[PDB]
Amino acid sequence: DPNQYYKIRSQAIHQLKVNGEDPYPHKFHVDISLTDFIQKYSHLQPGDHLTDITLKVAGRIHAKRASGGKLIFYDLRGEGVKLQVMANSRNYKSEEEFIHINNKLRRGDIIGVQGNPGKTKKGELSIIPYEITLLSPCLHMLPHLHFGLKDKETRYRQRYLDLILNDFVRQKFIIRSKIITYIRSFLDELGFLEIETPMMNIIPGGAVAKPFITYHNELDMNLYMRIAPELYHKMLVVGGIDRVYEIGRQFRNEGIDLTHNPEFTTCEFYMAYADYHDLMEITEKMVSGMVKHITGSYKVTYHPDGPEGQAYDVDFTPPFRRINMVEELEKALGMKLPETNLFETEETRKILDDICVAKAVECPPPRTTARLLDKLVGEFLEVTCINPTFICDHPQIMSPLAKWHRSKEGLTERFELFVMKKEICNAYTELNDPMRQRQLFEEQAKAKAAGDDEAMFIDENFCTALEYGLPPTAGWGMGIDRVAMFLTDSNNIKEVLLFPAMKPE
Template sequence: MAHYDLRVDEDEETLERNQHFKERTQEIQALKGKGEDPYPHKYHVDISLTEFINKYSHLQPEDHLTDVVLSVAGRIHAKRASSAKLLFYDLRGEGVKLQVMASSKFYTSTKAFEAINDKLRRGDVAGVRGHPGKTKKGELSIIPIEMTLLSPCLHMLPRLHNVLSDKETRFRQRYLDLILNSYVRKTFVTRSRIITYLRSFLDQQGFLEVETPMMSQIPGGAVARPFVTQHNELDLKLYMRIAPELYHKMLVVGGLDRVYEIGRQFRNEGIDLTHNPEFTTCEFYMAYADYNDLMTITEELLSGMVKNITGGYKITYHPDGKGKDKASCEIDFTPPFRRVSMTHDLAKIMDVTFPPPETYDSDETRRFFDELCAQKGVECPPPRTTARLLDKLVGEFLEVTCINPTFICDHPQIMSPLAKGHRHVRELTERFELFVMKKELCNAYTELNDPIKQRELFEQQAKAKAEGDDEAMLIDETFCTALEYGLPPTAGWGMGIDRLAMFLTDSNNIKEVLSFPIMKPDDNKAAAPV
């Protein structure tokens, strides 16, 4: 299949596109001058293209239901003239195609037939009123008695034998990507099905969907660099939320025992194949549960979702992108998922004896991990705290073993300031992260509900921030006060919906599953017509 690349013969292509735009604009203005409206307010559609195809696919070649008159609408993707009195159009919409077999024999009048066929161009949105039928070759068609221009396309679309493949154009002009590439629509349909399944699953488990603030005076609930904004009337600096966690736990304090939220988070960090500064998560909090309960729920939720959407537990994924020369991996979501202990299994893989967990807040242990990273060639930008050094080692040696869904459990307390201490091993926490294809998908833990211990950990985070860690948390007095009223034993869980959508649509770039991803400024400012 040929590919349409805007960089090839750019000057010639630009001239052709600009000339087309100029001529098409003049044609539309001429229609207006004759008193015709190329942009009508309304068009009554009797049946969708999908319904039409499903309802009349049974017709036999040369069938023509002259007693049935229906109106459909869509975008014209092709126009072919067999003769002056017989033209064929490809009408597309909803991810399907329906042929329009326009014959002057069945049209309201020859004059009207010639007039409308002179108006319609490839790319236009059009309405067609006519009879269902099939051609001699058995192609399902609608045979019009009337056609209407509903919205003209002023720009020239790429030719039919080409595919829009330039990613810059695809992501900047997502509408054009959707018009030309049918698989893009399927990606967003799958994303929608993920969210629908999530809501249904949690609703059935007795959770209440809630909404919490997008802006706050203190960024909390995660370790991340926030976006800063300003409220002019109050002269108040506000932060876009990096996670809704603290608000959710305050709702549980108030007696809403099971809450969840599907929404946007904002983190002022890098952009790469799996990160976008604006992303979507699902978080839920469940009173009287612990992280063991959530591992079971996670297995049930994800395995059920994958089977519901794909028909089975196993999916094929191309980590380096699709193509004949690209390797594929099979990801098996069959429960139960593999479980590993973070520090125990990391030390085992590295064949190193780690200091005991109770010393992780000491300077000696920090130096141990600092030297270990240097010895293994693992980079860690300043500040080189124990938590950051250990996180880099986990990423380099443990996360890479997680192809099928794997729970990495029992993180040190210094890496988990909001998690409850482990009931059996001091200085570890009851926390897990679920990794798939070496990427974090879920994060969950038994929630820390001791207000005194929580304040101590916040103070440690504030100290780290003062030492240069701009991702560390601040002390949130409002949250600390809420904890003093009593948070029941609670477990909390969060999942990145964008990454899950990547796996279930076989996309190795997060931009593929975002309708409008953040892009660098366009040097050309206005995108050239395509």
């Protein structure tokens, strides 16, 4: 039937081309948006008809309803709003043209309408057309909210259908755009320079991840898609550009789930002469400010398990709670952890392994100290982070690019911001001692050559940059998609990506 529909409409539209009726005209002059039209004429009384005012509007037909032989209603939509077209034979250019155009149009078609503002007796704002023009026909049977589409996969594979039928989808992507615009405004006003750094590298760095590999024709070498801009940013700080930020795509060749997509958008910024304490204050101010600006309040409703589960109000009222990782974990475990440092030590690793086993906390190979800790933190600390919460002072073994903690041995000046059990920010006082950085790279290098395939490559170039002097500095990253998820009540990252990656259908 839809298949039959398409054949018949396609032939009809073709016959229009043959007869010179031009079903895809080059230019229609819209006078006014539907939103403005509604705002301007909502004041009309039932039965009003402004015969002296003629306007041109356009949109998509979502419904067609005949009422006798001389009256037809079209539900015209655009910009997330709707306007009724009440086409009356006596007000149309001619009766013959009225019949011809009405017989031509179908639900789904893009049309332009020239007519007067009015309102029906029932109080429905309308436009009363002198002329209607087909601008672009819909060749398929347009789906309808009652039937469709709620099926996720179709929604993501044909986002245009999703946008046509589901107003809430448009609203999510408006919010997403507002988030990014807010962040740029915030950072611009603090004197940051918006920069662009390479998305293709000889060596991916700045994060723990599996990279994408590609071949570059001109240089006749393989290159890696970036996993993070971090090392480039710090080199520019070395360069004397004190405040930089970049909102852009990163690529990580890993799993796909509710909070993970292989390409995703982040904001990173770096700030000379700042430390992690400064960044927590800035983070609180930016995030709370953002939430209040966009939503109207500090409290946001979120369904962590979707609409079939319970909802919770998430309170972004500053200041955010702070917890120290090792401290809080020890409290949650009811036991003390062995101390760790830069070097992987089998005694310590074994103790953590035993703890994971005893607590039934899974950790896939390789079961390294950092990974076992990460899994433990996930099970016992992250799960308690409902409202925005800083988890602070990560062990050095988990943080190869973070500066050592100035008062806590074996720890670093790092924080992560968690919301609804998920990490929305990662930041630290930057390691700026080249000897120490090289030392950490050598440990990462060893561990790669030992079986850790997510471990970092030595970046000999970056270390050299550090030798010229990186000022005391603090850096920061935010997962833009995740923030968007929390501010749009989405529990699936695919909801905030216009065209998410999908397995072939």
